[PDB]
Amino acid sequence: GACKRVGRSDAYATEFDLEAEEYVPIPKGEVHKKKEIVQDVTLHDLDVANARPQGGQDIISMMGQL
């Protein structure tokens, strides 16, 4: 359920002559890829993940102090 904007396809690179946009080539491979990944975690990673909201959940953490 993760997703990322890689950019705007450079077939649109001339929508305008200047725009604040990151034009990238269309993917040259298959549009769908299936990969076997063996993923490791530790019981401590589970401790940390269950004790407190982590990463992009904990945006207020940017304030530091408490």
């Binding site: 077939a11 649109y12 690179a13 001339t14 929508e15």
Partner: peptide, 11 residues
């Protein structure tokens, strides 16, 4: 009937 011409909208 010479209505076979086609325009485009891609940049």
């Amino acid at each position: 009937t010479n209505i076979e011409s086609a325009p485009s909208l891609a940049p």
